[PDB]
């Protein structure tokens, strides 16, 4: 008697925006923006972070006596540095090219501490000096990986030593220069005043002299230590020479892994969980192309965007029996998106048009996958350190990141809105196409009712309805009863 063409509706409250419309309820939707992390600092790729606790990188490498827990450090996946750490240069001072060193340590992971210039090789020098500022259990002490060479007997013979890098890999060497508060200190500790410190390799040629001056006291000391560093290439030799004010390394650091990592600023601790993408706020476990958790993320991560939601429609407008697509609302049809409602002598009921639904389905699936699969995910560390004398460079870096963030956010927002507009138009087109696909086959044997349904002039039984539904209706056989 009658066959209608219509579409699926359900109880969904999911909403999407489109270019032309806002707050459109749809039957199905896909959220492509990750919003939730787990609140924990996790092992990255199964490898724990280097937890410095209250130590800075300089404190760690020099051997600040309060960083003893870091004297032997296992391979790390990232470094967790507390912002504004306490244990750094206990004996007040400064560290040259510190930001470059922190950057160097990013692509490092494990390194081996190697003794290069054993403390007891320094005969004819006093190697027992220390300071209350670095005291351990009351007793004055010093950086543990460094030797403070001072006068012995009544002399300071030229201090010399060298090291040939036969360790198997490029090595990090740190040394420094003492800068006394006054002349009395300079003479008491080194005998001579007109001193210098000279260090070099096949590429390094650095010579400096102490700057004796009154300075504000820091940690009780009016003096300062200046530290610097180089990388000694494999098979090269580093020479040291001094007539005073030299703080020699005892140890160097052989880089062992040279992998890809970074330094995270965080006050937390390791929670013994695992991730592939770690932000300072917690780990992100997601397969989505975008996230909005935190920009300073270390790992293989989704793009960070400023958006709050990015939701693709995948379904039909959710528009809540004897009418077709014109009115919508077939909540009684749960077989597929597009279909038929037939009524005849044997009975009535809903059926999906499986060919139409599957094609529409595959189309939507491919569209969603294009949006997601075309996004390029790479390992990144993001954060960079700058000194207070590098503000133009720091700002350039910030501007670059803000620039890319606005580009990606804008594109994510419009890609979603433009695609949702096409998705809903696509589905409206597909139901209309069944209406006409069928109308063109039924031709003059039916009456168009104006509501998305066709009335048969001839009697149409369940075998007839099956024939109409899969497109095999035999027009000539039914040119009767009119």
């Amino acid at each position, epitope marked *: 008697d009658q066959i209608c063409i219509g579409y699926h509706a359900n109880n969904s409250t999911e909403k999407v925006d489109t270019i032309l419309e806002r707050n459109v309820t749809v039957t199905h939707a896909k959220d492509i923006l990750e919003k939730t992390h787990n609140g924990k600092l996790c092992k990255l790729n199964g490898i724990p972070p280097l937890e410095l606790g209250d130590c800075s990188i300089a404190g760690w490498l020099l051997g600040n006596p309060e960083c003893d827990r870091l004297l032997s450090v296992p391979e790390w996946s990232y470094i967790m540095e507390k912002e504004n750490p306490r244990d750094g240069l206990c004996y007040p001072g400064s560290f040259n090219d510190y930001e470059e060193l922190k950057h160097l340590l990013s692509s490092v992971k494990h390194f081996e501490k190697v003794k290069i210039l054993p403390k007891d090789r320094w005969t004819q020098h006093t190697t027992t000096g220390g300071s*209350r500022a670095c005291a351990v259990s009351g007793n004055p002490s010093f950086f543990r990986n460094m030797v403070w060479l001072t006068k012995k007997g009544s002399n300071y013979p030229v201090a010399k030593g060298s090291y040939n890098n036969t360790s198997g890999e490029q090595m990090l060497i740190i040394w420094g220069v003492h800068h006394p508060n006054d002349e009395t200190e300079q003479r008491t500790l080194y005998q001579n005043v007109g001193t210098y410190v000279s260090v070099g390799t096949s590429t390094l040629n650095k010579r400096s002299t102490p700057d004796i001056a009154t300075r504000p006291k820091v940690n009780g000391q009016g003096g300062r230590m200046e530290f610097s560093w180089t990388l000694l290439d494999m098979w090269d030799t580093i020479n040291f020479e001094s007539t005073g004010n030299l703080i020699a390394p005892e140890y160097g650091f052989k880089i062992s892994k040279r992998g890809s990592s970074g330094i995270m600023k965080t006050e937390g601790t390791l929670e013994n969980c695992e991730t592939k993408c770690q932000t300072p706020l917690g780990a992100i476990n997601t397969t989505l192309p975008f996230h909005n958790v935190h920009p300073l993320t270390i790992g293989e991560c989704p793009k960070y965007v400023k958006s709050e939601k990015l939701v693709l429609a995948t379904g039909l407008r959710n528009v809540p029996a004897i009418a077709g697509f014109i009115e919508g609302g077939w909540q009684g049809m749960v077989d597929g998106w597009y279909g038929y409602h037939h009524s005849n002598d044997q009975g009535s009921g809903y059926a999906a048009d499986k060919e139409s639904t599957q094609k529409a389905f595959d189309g939507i699936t491919n569209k969603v996958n294009s949006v997601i699969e075309k996004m390029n995910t790479q390992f990144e560390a993001v954060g960079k350190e700058f000194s207070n004398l590098e503000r133009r460079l720091e700002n350039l870096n910030k501007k670059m990141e803000d620039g890319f963030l606005d580009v990606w956010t804008y594109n994510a927002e419009l890609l979603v809105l433009m695609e949702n507009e096409r998705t809903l138009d696509f589905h409206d087109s597909n139901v209309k196409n069944l209406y006409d696909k069928v109308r063109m086959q039924l031709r003059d044997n039916v009456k168009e009712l104006g509501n998305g349904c066709f009335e048969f002039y001839h009697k149409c039984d369940d075998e007839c309805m099956n024939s109409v539904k899969n497109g095999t209706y035999d027009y000539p056989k039914y040119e009767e009863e009119s």
Partner: antibody
Amino acid sequence: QVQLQESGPGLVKPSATLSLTCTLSGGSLSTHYWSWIRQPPGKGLEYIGNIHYSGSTNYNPSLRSRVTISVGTSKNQFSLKLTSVTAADTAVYYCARDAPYSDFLSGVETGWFDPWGQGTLVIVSS
Amino acid sequence: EIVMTQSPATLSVSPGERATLSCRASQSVSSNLAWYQQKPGQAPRLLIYGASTRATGIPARFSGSGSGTDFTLTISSLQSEDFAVYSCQQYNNWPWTFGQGTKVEIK
């Protein structure tokens, strides 16, 4: 501050080893260099040498072949071993702490002794 | 070594009077010289170091100066507690050396 007390035999033979200890009270060795000083009757003072807690030492070049200074494990005592005593070694022996450079720096040379001890007179005879 | 010679061997300076003691080095000691006060029955006490820097616990009546080879110790007004044997120490060389001791006695 600390007090220092010398201890040991007041009698040594003309062909002998002399051995004296110094005990600290009110403190411990604490990164400072500790010294021995000798005063033969009728003479001024003679510096013998010192020792750091770590075992680093400095000896008067003229007595190197005959002198050992050591600490041990109590961390508040140190001692002097003088070999081949010829009795020219009769003297008052004193222990002293090398003055620290400053409240903040230690373990460095100064060359003046601030806490000294009464001393003990050792007679070498037979 | 550096020989430290003191003079006069003794002073007879009476209570209330200024007492001046001298020390002469065979080699320059820069400013690296200390003075000590020794008395029978007690440990020597440091009075001065660094040629002119007063040791703590020492009254202002004690002062001194000099450089190179020529140094002095001065007691601005000698008290009864200051009758002692005083000596100078050289610490600008190795070994460190001391003078023979100058006795202050009452006339």
